[PDB]
Write a protein that binds this ligand. Sequence first.
Ligand code: UTP
Ligand code: MG
Lengths: 394, 117, 51, 49, 54, 315, 38, 52, 74, 97, 21, 52, 154, 124, 58, 290, 49
Amino acid sequence: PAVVDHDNITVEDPNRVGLNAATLDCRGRIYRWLRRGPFFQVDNYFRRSVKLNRDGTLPTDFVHEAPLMRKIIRLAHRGHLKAACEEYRRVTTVPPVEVYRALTACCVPGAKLADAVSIFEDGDSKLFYVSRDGEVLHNLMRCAIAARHRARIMWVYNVMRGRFYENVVVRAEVDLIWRYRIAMIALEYLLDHECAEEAAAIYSYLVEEELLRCDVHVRVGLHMREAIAAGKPITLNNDVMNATSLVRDATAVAPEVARELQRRHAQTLQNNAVEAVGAGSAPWSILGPLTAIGPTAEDTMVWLQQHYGDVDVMSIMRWARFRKGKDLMAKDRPQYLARAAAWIELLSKRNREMEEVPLTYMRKSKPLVLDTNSNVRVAWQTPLMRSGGPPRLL
Amino acid sequence: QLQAQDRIICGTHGAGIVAHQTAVNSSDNPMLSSVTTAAPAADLSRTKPHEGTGTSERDPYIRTLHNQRSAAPESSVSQSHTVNAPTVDECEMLAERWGTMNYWHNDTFPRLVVFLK
Amino acid sequence: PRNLNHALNYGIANYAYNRGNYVETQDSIWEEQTASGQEGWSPATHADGLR
Amino acid sequence: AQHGLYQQATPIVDELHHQKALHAGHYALLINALACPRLGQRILHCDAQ
Amino acid sequence: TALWDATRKIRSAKEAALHRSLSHNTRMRASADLKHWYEEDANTLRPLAFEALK
Amino acid sequence: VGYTPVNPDTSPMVAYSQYHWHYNLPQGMERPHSVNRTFAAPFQSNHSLVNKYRGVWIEFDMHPAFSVALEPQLRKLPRGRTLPKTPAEEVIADYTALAPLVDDEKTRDLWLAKVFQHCAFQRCGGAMELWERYCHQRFTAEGATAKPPLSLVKSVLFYCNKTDNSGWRALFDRCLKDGWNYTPLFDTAQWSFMLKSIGRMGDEDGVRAVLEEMLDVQADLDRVEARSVVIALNAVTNADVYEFVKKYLFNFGERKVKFLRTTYSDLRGHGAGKLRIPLKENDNMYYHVCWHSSIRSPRQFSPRQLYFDYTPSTL
Amino acid sequence: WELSRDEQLFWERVELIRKGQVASIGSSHKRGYADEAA
Amino acid sequence: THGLREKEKHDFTILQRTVRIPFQGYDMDRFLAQQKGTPYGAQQLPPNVVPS
Amino acid sequence: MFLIHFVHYKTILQKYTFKFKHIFLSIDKYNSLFFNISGILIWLNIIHINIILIKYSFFILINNFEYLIILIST
Amino acid sequence: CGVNAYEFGGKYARTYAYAFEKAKKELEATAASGFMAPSLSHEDTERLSDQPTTSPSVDRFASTTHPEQRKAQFVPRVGPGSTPLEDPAADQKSEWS
Amino acid sequence: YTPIWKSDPAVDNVAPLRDED
Amino acid sequence: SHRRDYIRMGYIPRYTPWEWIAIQEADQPLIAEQIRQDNIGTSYFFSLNRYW
Amino acid sequence: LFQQNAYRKTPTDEHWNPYIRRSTENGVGHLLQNKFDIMRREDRLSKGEQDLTERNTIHYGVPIQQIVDEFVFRHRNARGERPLDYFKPFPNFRALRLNRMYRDVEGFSLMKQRPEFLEWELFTRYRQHHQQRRRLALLHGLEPVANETAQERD
Amino acid sequence: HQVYLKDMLHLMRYPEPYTHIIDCRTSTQKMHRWVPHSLWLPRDEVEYALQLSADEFLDMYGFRKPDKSDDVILLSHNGIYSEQAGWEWKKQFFQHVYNYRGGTNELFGESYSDMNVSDVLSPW
Amino acid sequence: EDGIRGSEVTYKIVLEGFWDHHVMKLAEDVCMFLKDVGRQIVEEKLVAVRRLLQGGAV
Amino acid sequence: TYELVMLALSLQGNMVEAESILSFLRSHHSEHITVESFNALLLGHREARQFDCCDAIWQELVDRRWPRASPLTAELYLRSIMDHANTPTSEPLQSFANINVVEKKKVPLVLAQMDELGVPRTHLSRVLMDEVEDSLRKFQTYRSRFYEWGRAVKQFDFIEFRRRNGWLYDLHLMKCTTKQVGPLRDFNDPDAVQGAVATAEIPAFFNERPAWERPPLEETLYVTTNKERYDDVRGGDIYYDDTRGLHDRSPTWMNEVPETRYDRLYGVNHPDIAKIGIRRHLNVEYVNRK
Amino acid sequence: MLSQNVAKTTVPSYYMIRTNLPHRKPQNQWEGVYYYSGITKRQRHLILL
Ligand SMILES: O=c1ccn([C@@H]2O[C@H](COP(=O)(O)OP(=O)(O)OP(=O)(O)O)[C@@H](O)[C@H]2O)c(=O)[nH]1
Ligand SMILES: [Mg+2]
């Protein structure tokens, strides 16, 4: 099989790789050349070199091109995006994942979404999915956040869950911890801007992957790292997890959250009942679906459990803690309260069912006995609307 | 707009112009010389959805009527520029309603007069 | 009962209108085909025979 | 109830209503539970495809 | 009336059993029969009421 | 008329003739054609797939608690599609040191699978002890009930295959129906490496067992890489196993068989260098391979070569 | 049980049939098939 | 199998060549009804049968 | 042993009917348009013209395959 | 006393019992499979040893390799739309609702 | 070119079963 | 399909029949790039400079 | 009989094919799976509606256009059923169609079935009267309103 | 349609009522054993046998003529004669007709031939 | 703009034959086709629009 | 309450009423409407098997982008698509191919909409994702593949795959049509000599001798091969149909077969088969049925 | 062997040279492009399992 030396090319052509016009046996070759696909030269040059290693290792590390990648990264870090791309163009071999991490991370501050997305899309399926990574994805999601693009948040998330092809066949799939983080800033955003649907989707995925308790697992994981550093034994127990400051603090705030839920709900009931009449008080607010809380800690956890208990409330109170690096529980109490309240309100189907507005009751009808219009119908009338009238069936 | 359009175009299998009451019996006409008297129809029999045993109109030799849902075409009458008679439920909410100047001062059923009354 | 007016056409189908009156019958039809949306105010075409 | 044993739930509920320990939203909770939607899952996924 | 409610519940239960059975069985679904669904009902299935004593 | 045939698409005198459609007829479509709908052909490229993992996926399930805690040690081990070059001795020393400190069976075992894999990539021979030091007691020794995590099995097996070793035969046998039954869950890659190593060390009987097992477990035969099957069938000199290998050779596909012949003929051929250890000459097997190939492929008719010596008789 | 019974029954019928053949044909020989030449 | 069914259908098609479209009346309700003998004074007596 | 003698019931009912056309009902044929041929010109070595029916010809075919032929009002 | 009339009497008794035990076993599979019964064609099972001698999966045709001979009847019947009936391709068989 | 491989040994498949029974 | 005079007796459809359209349409795949959906924006910096 | 079932193991043998599966020819019995659908089918057959399972085979019948075409083909232009205006120079597209009765004749009982002498002309004059009524109506703005009750109609 | 060895053993241990195994062996000389639940219709007689009415048939072969819906398995030494008899069972239209290949030889370990035909062709 | 003069999306199909009447008749066919497909689609969008007009949230 | 009632009516398959309810809600109460209503109607139409309304409601729900569609919604509409796509027509339309498969071609469009709406495609039943993935693999392709998909090699390989599975019938290069159909004869003239204006390959089920003219089922009772004459034919057709009866035998058959115990029944119309039959010697009582 | 493998060429001779009869079928315009859409027995098995 022919191979082209790009160093050694001579007029003499020792290897006999060139296409000769007049030699014996040249004909079918010449035809073969004129029959070639549109990308033939380029595609074959690209695939004959640049292929996945027998190990499962990317081609990504090559000596001659390394200083270039160093330059790209170093440029992206000082925040020159265009410069970095102008050098990206000059790259002959697949660049390492670090390149893409740098480029997208550079893309985040200025909010450019489109360029980040096209970077990542350049790394997917073209280049063997060097660009499928936790960190890169993470940057993409944070970009979608900056630019307030809902559909693109969902798009990024959808990419990160991945497909049978990229998951099983390629074996390029994001790390567990990273999936947690991405999904979590997405959920943060959605629940803050009151998007019920996509919040419900992402939350349902968290539920499904057993990721509800995860932040705890990471905290516990660091303490256990220092404990292995000192040489002591470590284990995963419920007592070890409920010893964490996170869990303890959440448990401490629980009754306050529940009281806030109660107040908010009561006042929503009030509003609905007043709008029902178009403004006194309607009967709608007299007795609502929420039961009064007993005066205790256990009564609180139980109450939350039975009324709001389709969601896991403890984990949501954990997530609602930090905002933009600021700790809400230890600085602003009421803001944290209204936030955990809002999030539990949004993520639960039960609360949604009980917070609804009273609607008027639709009349059934029969068509006229003497026809004039097809559009004019005889409406059924409830016993309430006509007192008197003969005794009638349903 | 035919007379009894459904009973005939939609409800009858032939669009009315195929005569289903016909005997397949042998005829003495010169051109009908190919016609052979038919055996009576198969008694307990399960047909293909596009056919029949040819007994009656209710059961033709070839079924024309589709078995799907039938929906008459969507009116080309303007729903927007037409103004109907005011309903009750419209007159309750009349204070929140947004009309065209043609809707308030409309020649038949002006809504402004009602709104003020 | 839906047959109250039957006497007006005996044995022939029930009608809610006078079927001996030409004008009123045609008017009934008019109103029907109006309510069904076969008849009504529609943006004109060049071919509709404006004259 | 949710797991699809209503039979074992009936005596308990009867006895609860007896002592007047049940209140407004609680009945909602129970009647809603009678739809077995922890069974809803096993059916949805396995059987109904 | 109450007894009727109870009986109705019982027959309902028997039939529900049959229904789960027929819906989940492939080899019986193989022969295409509506009859399978009607060839056993609250009359035919067990427990039989007139057999209760023994 | 000439030595150059009229191309019937361009030529009006063809197109517009009585045996085709003249231009004054109404130019519609004659009949519909559903080709791709009636019978559909599955996709097999002549080129192998570009993005496939090509190696043995070791299935890292670790709890995201220890996976944070053990990160400084793990980072030296392989993650997905990443193969750090850290010296094997160091990693084994790390596990030997820290692993008794952690209480989980799952975590320790997953960790160990990763160690084995990392050592299998550098071909270090002193790994097998870790099997006899920790694991052998509760899994392969004296009918111990415990059933090993699949990751571990796959990893150790890949190590025995990469570093040529006898120990594999004890593990493999434990994975059949009556034992742990991990056999249906193996990657195609696994079987490839297995057959390759086994064929290198030259066990006809190991080969027969493994091919039997692959055929039964419904592995993907034609997508088992050619190199490994050729090496494995190369090592077979015994009469019985030879019979078995004809009868088994029929279990492959037409294409696969042609490129088995081709792979074989290249491997003792020009491509002899492609191998780390050169092949050993098996003439009967190589021949029977080329023969199977000549049989299963379609026959071309070359009358001058067949009937070259024929003569008519008036008998 | 029934396997045994049916066995003897079988060889019985085989017997009778075979005797029928030899009797009617007259001989124990039979033709080949025109395809059994080759 | 002998295809007499198919021949029956085709022959029906042949017979169709002759027939007219029926006259359904100017007032079609009235006509249909009169045909069935419902309206007033439209009642016809059964054809008199010679006793056997 | 044998307790009884019985009459052998069977359900032979065919009630479902499945026919599947053999593959050769849908196989292709060559169909042609057929007009009355008004005339013919043939030419290979020597041009020969037949004329069946003399009329203004509405249509003309030309075919080159071996002999040149012109089928007039074909 | 008349068992020898029925299918579960005599020589076929052993068959009946066989079936019976299979059923039990089979039921357990359906209990494990989520009450969606496994394939009647036994395409679900992992091992070739698994599929019973009874299953329709076992390929009984005149010839294994030569496709002309794999027909059920004398000529090769086609499905609606002139789609091949006799030996279905993998994508022709659809299990959908 | 036939036979391809050695035909199966004379083994009787019927006997073992009937012996068990 | 039911028309037995189709090419033989001289009936050649002036309008290609619905069924046939449905089939020809059903046979070939639809290019994915023909859908034309852009919700992001134009990529100013990177897009034109992408891998060679 | 051989043709129907040769090696056939079960009636559904070919039902791996989704298109043979839902064919309703033999009956609907194999497309009923769960009790629920069978109750439903029972219900809707008692209400005189169509059975939803029968909709498994989509049957587009022959369109009306095709029917009329076949009719007027079998009749070699069917001159019996044409309006006389069809035989005069340049008939408009309304004269191009068959003899169907429209809705305009529905209120006139003077002409019974056979209209006597001058009846038809009289009727035609009534018809024109109504067309002018419609014109006056649209003119001064009193026409049917799709919504209207009977008092407003009155 | 072929019937494999497994099917045959399974049909020895657990037989079906209306499944009939049938012996095609031509010469009484060479048949030294009995196939479980089998019945003897020799190949040479098949063409006549199938032309019989059920009564005439019962009379001649001493067992019931299988219906056309029932499974009929054919058996011989090589499988050759069982195949020719198979075509015969097919022509009279029988719905399930199966042929065990190398049947009695695989069963009983006997090496025999229904007919003598040899692989080698005589040089033209 | 109203009526004919204006639209959201304009498609132009340029048909090309070797013979004039070919492309003419072709144009008639394709045109009839797009008349029916066109009616279908636009009708559906119309019922959607009418629903939307009848009421809905923001 | 209302979305529950809608769901009830829908499960019943009663659309008229369900949509009436949605209409009421649209008119008066609109600002409260959730997605589960459109889910109700969707599922409903899917039951009644009206797929154009199933389409109408998805398109409408895409236009108004509120309330947001749910992955359940897309599950419903997509399911509906596959359902429509898998239904057969009646026999008149079944001649050439199964039509309704075109509805699957709808999918890669719908999928695209899911991206624009922010409905993640990875929330779909595994079942449906298989079905839809198969739909994609049927009709979708990229620019890349499309530049290369007509390579002669690929075409011919497809031809070959068809060759190994023995379906050559529909392929272009690989079929050779033989049979011609002759003209119809007019009573208006025998004299007229017809000739061919044009020629087209069309399936034989258009014109083939009517079922009542031809012998009964020819597929089963007659083995027919269309074949070429080996001799030179001076005139006439170079392809003839070789037909033989399935049950055809040599006139000499009795002799080419070994003699049987029947032979002495020769030329006898009503034999006593009980007499030469073995049952009479075999049975002790032997009741003869005749 | 396979009966649909049928000679596409006439016996080699001077009729090929001295006549205007073309050597191949003309391309069929309405024949779709053969492309690969489908699965294996192996793949179906995998999915079901
Ligand atoms: O099919 C192939 C093709 C190519 N190679 C390439 O040939 C080199 C040496 O070829 P070998 O295949 O002889 O080495 P090996 O078995 O020890 O390699 P591993 O599989 O253990 O990695 C391998 O290291 C790889 O680079 C294969 O191993 N297999
Ligand atoms: Mg030169």
